[model samples]
Structures are given as C-alpha cells and as structure tokens.
Target: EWVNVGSPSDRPFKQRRSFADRCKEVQQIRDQHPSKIPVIIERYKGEKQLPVLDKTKFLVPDHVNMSELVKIIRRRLQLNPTQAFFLLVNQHSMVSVSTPIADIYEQEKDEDGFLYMVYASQET
Candidate 1:
C-alpha cells in the first residue's frame, strides 16, 4: 500500500517535496550522521517479480561497497539464490559492486542531494 505502483515517472520523493526541502533534509541527516550516505531506493517501473521495499530511504554506511549493499538489499527482500537482481544508479547505469557507496554518491547524487537507486529482479 505504501508503494505507489501507479505512476512510472522519476523520483517520487522529488515529486512529494520541493528541492529546497529535500536539500535541507539532506543537510540535517548529514550533520547528524556524517559517515552515512543518504539513499533513496525505488522499484523499477517494469519490475514484476520483486516486492516494493517498505522503506525507501536508507542511511547507508559510506564504507560499504556496492557488493555489500546489494547483499544487504537482497537480504531484506529475501530473494532466492536462483533469482537475478540488478541495481541501477539514476535509473540507468550499473556500477561495479566493488565500488564504494561514497564514490557512487559523489558522482550520482541527485540535485536534491540524495543518491537514488532503483532495483529490478528477474526469474532465472
């Protein structure tokens, strides 16, 4: 119910809040937890297999690698080993799991200052 499965547009959080508000929120979160990366995760519009995450916002550890984050997300979803899942930054490009989250955030963070990620899963 929390998931808005209707609209297939861009960042839903951006639609809900103004750019200034988002930036302020980012700032507060950063000030409180300087070591974490603020991330917004969403289901890919075309995704049919994976369930939408109940929580969209995540404060991930900066030291966490993409591979580690993927493992964490998979744990949350409890996907079977046979399933295939893909994570894309800015809803397009895939980064190497070996890369650190901090690096991805530095490059892919939205204008509002949150790194956005979308996930899709396929049955193998």
Candidate 2:
C-alpha cells in the first residue's frame, strides 16, 4: 500500500533546502549524470480535476521534448482522451511543444538547477 503524501507545493524543493545546499546537490547530480536534467513537476495550486502524481521528481533525458513529456505525464495520470491540461514552465505558459528539455532547462532552470513545471487542467 502507498501512502498519499501532501502536495509538493506545500513545501517545494527550494524550501526543502538552502540555496547553497541546492546548488551543491545540483552540481553533484550534473557531475554524476550529465545527460539527464533534474525536473520537478507539480499540479497547479488551484487544480481540482487532475490527481497529484506520486512522484514529483524526474530525471528526464535531455533529448526529450515538451510534447513527449506531456504524453508521458498524461499516461501517468491515466487521463481520459477528453481531458486536457497544459504545462507551465516556471509558472509561465506558451512553451513550444517541439522545444527539447535541454533548451527549456537552460532557459527556465532555477538557480538550484532543477527545472520546475506546474500542470493545470483547461478549466480556469
């Protein structure tokens, strides 16, 4: 059996560690796995339709693009074909689906070296 934990928004990764610690850990991670990017995906704070994912941390392959990532998330959520959602990079929208993870990470990665994304349903 799995325990249902609270949302990561309650205490995001940034809050879980000091700036220095986060940068240190990120450096270590990059050193260990240069091909992968650390990412944290969380549901929008106001989201009501989509269920929260059990795992928020992801080590995504650098080659993967936004559309592929969206598909992966949709499958994880077991979302119905009729349901729709959008991913917001660093709380900003209008990211290109064709953009690769490497590009997005480079542009939006936090100082801690983790790319943060918030997912929300179509509803306002």
Candidate 3:
C-alpha cells in the first residue's frame, strides 16, 4: 500500500517552474551576454555535390545581417560565379536567413564550444 501511505494526491501545490519559463530563461541570459563573444564555426557539406570543408573554420561575423556569412562562405569555398549555397543548423533545419547570427549561434552551440554549419549547394 505505498500508494495509500505516501500519496500526494490529497495536496495540490502550484508549480513555480514551467518548461516554457526555463526555455525563455536560458535564451535570455545567452542573448544578453554575447554580441561579441569569440567562438569558432566549423563547416561541412550536407549535399554530395557541394565542396568539403569539415576542417575549415567558418564565420567571424557579428549578427548584423544574413549576408555577411554568405560572403564568408563564398570566399572560403572559392566557388565559381555560377554557384549557390544552402545552410542549416540543428543538423538539418533551415533558418530564417535574417535571424541574427548571434541569436542563432547562442541558441544552438554545443558543449564543445562551436557551432557546426552544414550546407548544400548547386548552380544558381
């Protein structure tokens, strides 16, 4: 009768911690701390046709705009003028393309201290 002797069914207390609250809390602190924190971005190709750059470090851009990163990648890849690229984080999800790089990076980096970007590219 462990259920009968120790049941808290008789008492209902308000939950002070919620899942959404903690989610917001972590992101808030992360955002406030880093508009200029230095971290490395390692790049890879998600598509077979794209170039390989796993050993390549990517991006030194502040989240001023989405275009800065594309420029960086283009320089590194040294793609022909006819090339195009698609990028994602969290393994395979597409980003807004206009989301601040700082905001996106702060949210998805791993414990190892870097954001890994995988891309797929083709002709424009």
What lDDT tens digits, residue by residue, belong to model 1 across residues 38-90?
A: 99888777787887777788999989988788888878988898987877786
TM-scores, each model vs. reference: 0.82, 0.82, 0.49
Where is model 1 more than 4 Å wrong at Cα? 1-11, 91-95, 122-124
* Cα-based RMSD of candidate 3: 15.0
The parts of candidate 3 lying over 4 Å away from their true place are 1-46, 91-96, 122-124
In model 1, what is the error at residue 81, expressed in angstroms?
A: 0.6
lDDT of 1 at 65: 88
In angstroms, the error of model 3 at 124 is 17
Per-candidate local distance difference test: 0.81, 0.80, 0.51
User: What is the C-alpha local distance difference test score of candidate 3?
Assistant: 0.51
Candidate order, lDDT descending: 1, 2, 3
Better by lDDT, candidate 3 or 2: 2
